[PDB]
Amino acid sequence: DAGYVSQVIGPVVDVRFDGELPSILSSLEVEGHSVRLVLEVAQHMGDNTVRCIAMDSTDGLVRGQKVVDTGSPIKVPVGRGTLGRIMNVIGEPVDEQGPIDAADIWSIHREAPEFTEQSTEQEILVTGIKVVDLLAPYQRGGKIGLFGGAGVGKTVLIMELINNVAKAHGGFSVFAGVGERTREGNDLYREMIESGVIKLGAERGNSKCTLVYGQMNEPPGARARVALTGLTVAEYFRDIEGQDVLLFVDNIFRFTQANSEVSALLGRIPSAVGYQPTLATDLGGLQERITTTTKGSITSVQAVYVPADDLTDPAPATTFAHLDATTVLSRSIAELGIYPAVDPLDSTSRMLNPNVIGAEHYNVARGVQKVLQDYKNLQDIIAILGMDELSEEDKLTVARARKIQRFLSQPFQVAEVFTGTPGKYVDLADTISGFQGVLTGKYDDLPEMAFYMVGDIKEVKEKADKMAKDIASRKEADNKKVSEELKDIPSLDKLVSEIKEVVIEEDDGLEEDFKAEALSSETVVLNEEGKSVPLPKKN
Amino acid sequence: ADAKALDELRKPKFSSKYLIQHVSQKLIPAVKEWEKSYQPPVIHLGRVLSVGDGIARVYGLKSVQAGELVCFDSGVKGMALNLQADHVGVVVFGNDSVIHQGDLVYRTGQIVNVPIGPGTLGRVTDGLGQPIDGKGPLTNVRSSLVEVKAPGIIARQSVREPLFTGVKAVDALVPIGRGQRELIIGDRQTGKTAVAIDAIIHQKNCNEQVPKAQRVYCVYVAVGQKRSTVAQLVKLFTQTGAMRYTIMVSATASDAAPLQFLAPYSGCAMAEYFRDTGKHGLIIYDDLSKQSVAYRQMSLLLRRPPGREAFPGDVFYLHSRLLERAAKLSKELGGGSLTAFPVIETQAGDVSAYIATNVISITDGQIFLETELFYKGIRPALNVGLSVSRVGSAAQFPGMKQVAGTLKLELAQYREVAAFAQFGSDLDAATQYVLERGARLTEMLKQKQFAPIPIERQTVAVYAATKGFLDKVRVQDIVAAEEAVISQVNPAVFKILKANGKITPALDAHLKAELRKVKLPGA
Ligand SMILES: Nc1ncnc2c1ncn2[C@@H]1O[C@H](COP(=O)(O)OP(=O)(O)OP(=O)(O)O)[C@@H](O)[C@H]1O
Ligand SMILES: Nc1ncnc2c1ncn2[C@@H]1O[C@H](COP(=O)(O)OP(=O)(O)O)[C@@H](O)[C@H]1O
Ligand SMILES: [Mg+2]
Ligand SMILES: [Mg+2]
């Protein structure tokens, strides 16, 4: 019937069965454990033993603990009952709001959609971000990679992508938090409680987002499989409901990282730099399920953390081929103060094609990339010569590309709470003309800093107005400002009198709520019969 | 060779019995001839097969749990880490020279736990919970596990309260939050312990001023440091009074590798008491790159396969499950917080190391300490283009938020100009002016050691540089000009600015009034 725990090394449990072994990728329950511990069969060890990875911590497991087979892989609730809920890797509600009332629980493991059911149409997903929609335009029904190191703005960009696309999409979205901070998961959950994407109580069914969370405090088995749980929620929303789905995956790098933490304990000799030998095929088996079939559509946005800003690291370098669009975020762009820190050259999309987006959009994007590459080639001789002799053809292409660099920046709606500037949504025909004007030369009379952190081209020519009014200030300094006390302001000692004085306890509250139990000086052991005895004084 | 005839052999097929009835009455008189050489058999107790380098392979111990405290017969404790099929791999909490082959190992019944509570507040502790300061055992304290799972999404709330550190470079540019994990990273002797220590001293200075619930209880975990440094830190914290709110967990270099591995978890479990009982905690994991090294040794001697720089594969999970326990709880869980300050030492400024990149990807903010800024007089050596924080606004002083934006922008103006400091053309007196203000700002941001500043005296001092009031002095005496500013502006400004939090429109008036009323000696 059941099996027993044979070996526990870290997050990898060897379970021995006496006849009728479970299949690979089957789910096993451990009973006698405090919390619900789910093991997924990774391989067959060979002498009627399976080797598993755990979905929770293996602290507490006993060699010989009864492990029961489920006969199926990890099954999770999918459907309309999961909208507005937070799930585990194994489909438990962790939002503390009842059970998940969804019918037809599905396995998280299936094969990829086959070759004949592949869609070939390409329509542009307009996001409102004038560096995304211009240079590397996204595709609805396509896969999007948000590359970039630690601190460059992947989570802020995916928050703005949620706040732009997923609210005005109609269909359902799925967020898969794969190995990230729990604090920003709580931030996303709160910011979708207020914005009405997630609703609570009786109006729960009017929610449009399903959260599946596998964050950093989880063991490496729970981070390796939580992307499959978010993906099978999105696959139910694509295949059965027929809807068009959004699948935001925060740090798909942590999938490969979580598979790397267990692969030495699974008996695999290591590959290149320290990843598993099965890196490309695990990533392919995950990512080929995220497709647009003939039944429905999944538009996936994926953050990819590059380790130490290395794009040649094999875990993002494998990810690069599975994506339709690619938004590489660069640290040196964010060091200029430009946000979002999208590399305007290194970002690529399949939609940048004159047969798809039009020969005006394509040519203005190629012209912006041409003038930015020209400025990047001139940045060498500027720091040795000084940009004074370049004979007004290379001195103009520096100023135009600097206006383009400042014009690629954009204030975000989600970044108001740490910049202050209100966010901007810039439409596609509204950014093509705005970049065509600064490309052809319609805005050389404007100041260079006026392009920084604005929206449309009808905002740079107002920041020029406000800049030339604000430099029209700071002109006179005789008197009549706030510092002369005669206007409306009290003395400095009278403002002190307006302070309410707070209490000070000086006892810190540590003597009234603590259950100060007694701990033994001697150490207490268990003998052969399991009884609690003191340690025997004979070494 | 397969198991089917191997199970058929369980059925008897001997067909003759001319040895069975001969040796069965000959076995027991033979075994009794050697019963003083036999050791008694073992099932639920343990017996040491092999011991060496801090690892005991223990035969028996049938019902041990993974990660369970065991106790050898010589008194030294252990921890059952990898439970293999024929033996248990036990790491030794101490010197393994008192363990022999054939020593009895006793299962204690408990997963590893430390004493938590208010009784630890003021003690110097080892990495396992025993006090090492020579002041007797721990009283008014209770035992709690060191492997508590971090609070989830519904248990947390957004980080809002500041927890100032007293270092005005930090509190102006990289503002901490009260439940935020902030990594102090740099080379050796670049001032990381100084930043953590000044943070603890400033919590001592603020705990005697706030009403009993914004009080911050520091916990310092010294991993891998020598014992003279820990004793000097205890002398510092007692001679300034910071030891009344500070716990110190000290697994030194002489301790075993599992003690240094387990000491950040012991310190986090001691600091989670204040987080779970509504108070606010501050935890400093000094030398987390030494806890990773102790974990590497502990796992390599358990014969687990090595990875990048021979580290374990799960060395990311080691620091992620530790640092994720620093949270800000919801109001139904008390609202208590715990803010982490892990420390990583880099080698020659290589930020692309394995443990360094892992802990950068785990924590919220970063505090980079470069060794070239340290020797240029900039103390603390904050790398302002690389030190990031996730919170930014809504986690700092509202008065400092109005002033430090003009600092964050103008230091960026200074940095993009100073890479053209070989020629000196001084373009239109604008590239000359922005460096002539940015040098003043970097000289403003310097401060001494073991002397933290209250936040009002910081946001007055940056007010005197983001505005005018210091353009008349050279860059060589701004560290004395700001002493003239704080020393001669009337101290009733600081009370109003602390009680308001921001500058009221009656307060920036009086502050611009009194920054010309003072005589600064800059000539
Ligand atoms: N703000 C400061 N002003 C002056 N000196 C400082 C300051 N901060 C640190 N120092 C000096 O720098 C030296 C190194 O300090 P600290 O021990 O904090 O660095 P560390 O990185 O912890 O060193 P280690 O890597 O050896 O642990 C100390 O001798 C200290 O006196
Ligand atoms: N659009 C933006 N505007 C302003 N600041 C930003 C923006 N995007 C990112 N940042 C800064 O970068 C920091 C970290 O960004 P984050 O989204 O956490 O990147 P990652 O997830 O890759 O670490 C934030 O604290 C913020 O200050
Ligand atoms: Mg992130
Ligand atoms: Mg140090």
CSV table of N, CA and C in Angstrom, one decimal, chain A residues 36 38 55-56 74-77 85-95 100 108 175-177 210-215 217-218 222-223 225-230 232-233, chain B residues 149 152-153:
chain,number,residue,atom,x,y,z
A,36,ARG,N,1.5,19.6,6.4
A,36,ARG,CA,1.3,18.8,5.2
A,36,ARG,C,2.6,18.8,4.3
A,38,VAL,N,4.4,17.3,1.1
A,38,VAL,CA,4.2,16.7,-0.2
A,38,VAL,C,5.5,16.4,-0.8
A,55,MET,N,8.0,19.6,-0.9
A,55,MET,CA,7.4,20.9,-1.1
A,55,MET,C,7.4,21.7,0.1
A,56,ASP,N,7.8,21.1,1.3
A,56,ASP,CA,8.0,21.9,2.5
A,56,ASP,C,9.3,21.4,3.1
A,74,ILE,N,1.0,16.5,-8.5
A,74,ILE,CA,0.5,17.6,-7.6
A,74,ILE,C,-0.7,18.2,-8.3
A,75,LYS,N,-1.9,18.0,-7.7
A,75,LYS,CA,-3.1,18.6,-8.3
A,75,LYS,C,-3.5,19.8,-7.5
A,76,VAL,N,-3.9,20.8,-8.2
A,76,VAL,CA,-4.2,22.2,-7.6
A,76,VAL,C,-5.6,22.6,-8.1
A,77,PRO,N,-6.3,23.4,-7.4
A,77,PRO,CA,-7.6,23.9,-7.9
A,77,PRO,C,-7.3,24.9,-9.0
A,85,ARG,N,-7.6,34.7,-5.3
A,85,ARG,CA,-7.0,33.9,-4.2
A,85,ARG,C,-5.5,33.8,-4.4
A,86,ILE,N,-4.9,33.5,-3.3
A,86,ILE,CA,-3.4,33.2,-3.2
A,86,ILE,C,-3.3,31.7,-3.0
A,87,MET,N,-2.5,31.1,-3.8
A,87,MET,CA,-2.3,29.6,-3.7
A,87,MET,C,-0.9,29.3,-3.4
A,88,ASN,N,-0.7,28.1,-2.9
A,88,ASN,CA,0.6,27.5,-2.7
A,88,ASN,C,1.2,26.9,-4.0
A,89,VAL,N,2.3,26.2,-3.8
A,89,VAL,CA,2.7,25.3,-4.9
A,89,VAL,C,1.8,24.1,-5.0
A,90,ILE,N,1.2,23.7,-3.9
A,90,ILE,CA,0.3,22.5,-3.9
A,90,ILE,C,-1.2,22.9,-3.8
A,91,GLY,N,-1.5,24.2,-4.1
A,91,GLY,CA,-2.8,24.6,-4.2
A,91,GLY,C,-3.6,24.9,-2.9
A,92,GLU,N,-2.8,25.2,-1.8
A,92,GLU,CA,-3.6,25.5,-0.6
A,92,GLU,C,-3.8,27.1,-0.6
A,93,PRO,N,-4.9,27.5,0.0
A,93,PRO,CA,-5.2,28.9,0.2
A,93,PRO,C,-4.3,29.5,1.3
A,94,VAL,N,-3.5,30.4,1.0
A,94,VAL,CA,-2.6,31.1,2.0
A,94,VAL,C,-3.0,32.5,2.3
A,95,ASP,N,-4.2,32.9,1.7
A,95,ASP,CA,-4.8,34.2,2.0
A,95,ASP,C,-5.7,34.3,3.2
A,100,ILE,N,-10.6,26.9,-1.3
A,100,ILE,CA,-10.7,27.3,-2.6
A,100,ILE,C,-11.8,26.5,-3.3
A,108,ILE,N,-0.4,19.7,-12.2
A,108,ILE,CA,0.5,20.7,-12.6
A,108,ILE,C,1.5,20.3,-13.7
A,175,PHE,N,-0.6,35.8,-11.7
A,175,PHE,CA,0.7,36.2,-11.2
A,175,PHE,C,1.4,35.0,-10.5
A,176,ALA,N,2.6,34.6,-11.0
A,176,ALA,CA,3.3,33.5,-10.4
A,176,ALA,C,4.6,34.1,-9.7
A,177,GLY,N,4.5,34.2,-8.4
A,177,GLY,CA,5.7,34.7,-7.7
A,177,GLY,C,6.6,33.5,-7.4
A,210,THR,N,-5.4,35.6,-10.3
A,210,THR,CA,-5.1,34.5,-9.5
A,210,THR,C,-3.6,34.6,-9.1
A,211,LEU,N,-3.4,34.6,-7.8
A,211,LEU,CA,-2.0,34.7,-7.3
A,211,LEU,C,-1.5,33.3,-6.9
A,212,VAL,N,-0.3,32.9,-7.3
A,212,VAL,CA,0.3,31.7,-6.9
A,212,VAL,C,1.7,32.1,-6.5
A,213,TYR,N,2.1,31.7,-5.2
A,213,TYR,CA,3.3,32.3,-4.6
A,213,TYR,C,4.2,31.2,-4.1
A,214,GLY,N,5.5,31.3,-4.5
A,214,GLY,CA,6.5,30.3,-4.2
A,214,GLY,C,7.8,31.0,-3.7
A,215,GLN,N,7.7,31.9,-2.7
A,215,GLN,CA,8.7,32.9,-2.5
A,215,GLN,C,10.0,32.3,-1.8
A,217,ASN,N,11.4,32.1,1.1
A,217,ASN,CA,11.5,31.4,2.3
A,217,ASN,C,11.2,29.9,2.1
A,218,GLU,N,10.6,29.6,1.0
A,218,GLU,CA,10.2,28.2,0.7
A,218,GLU,C,11.5,27.3,0.4
A,222,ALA,N,9.7,23.7,-3.5
A,222,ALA,CA,8.5,24.5,-3.6
A,222,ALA,C,8.7,25.7,-4.6
A,223,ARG,N,9.9,26.1,-4.8
A,223,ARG,CA,10.2,27.1,-5.8
A,223,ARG,C,10.4,26.5,-7.2
A,225,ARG,N,8.5,24.1,-8.5
A,225,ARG,CA,7.3,23.7,-9.0
A,225,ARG,C,6.1,24.7,-9.0
A,226,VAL,N,6.4,25.9,-8.4
A,226,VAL,CA,5.3,26.9,-8.3
A,226,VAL,C,5.0,27.5,-9.6
A,227,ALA,N,6.0,27.6,-10.5
A,227,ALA,CA,5.8,28.1,-11.9
A,227,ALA,C,4.8,27.2,-12.6
A,228,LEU,N,4.9,25.8,-12.4
A,228,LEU,CA,4.0,24.9,-13.0
A,228,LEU,C,2.6,25.1,-12.4
A,229,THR,N,2.4,25.5,-11.2
A,229,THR,CA,1.1,25.7,-10.6
A,229,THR,C,0.5,27.0,-11.2
A,230,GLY,N,1.2,28.1,-11.3
A,230,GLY,CA,0.7,29.3,-12.0
A,230,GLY,C,0.4,29.0,-13.4
A,232,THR,N,-0.4,26.0,-14.8
A,232,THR,CA,-1.6,25.2,-15.0
A,232,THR,C,-2.9,26.0,-14.7
A,233,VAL,N,-2.8,27.0,-13.8
A,233,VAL,CA,-4.0,27.9,-13.7
A,233,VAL,C,-4.2,28.7,-15.0
B,149,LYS,N,9.5,29.1,10.3
B,149,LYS,CA,9.2,29.6,8.9
B,149,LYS,C,8.8,31.1,9.0
B,152,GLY,N,4.2,34.9,6.2
B,152,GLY,CA,3.8,34.9,4.8
B,152,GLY,C,3.3,36.3,4.3
B,153,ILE,N,2.4,36.2,3.3
B,153,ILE,CA,1.9,37.4,2.7
B,153,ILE,C,0.8,38.1,3.6
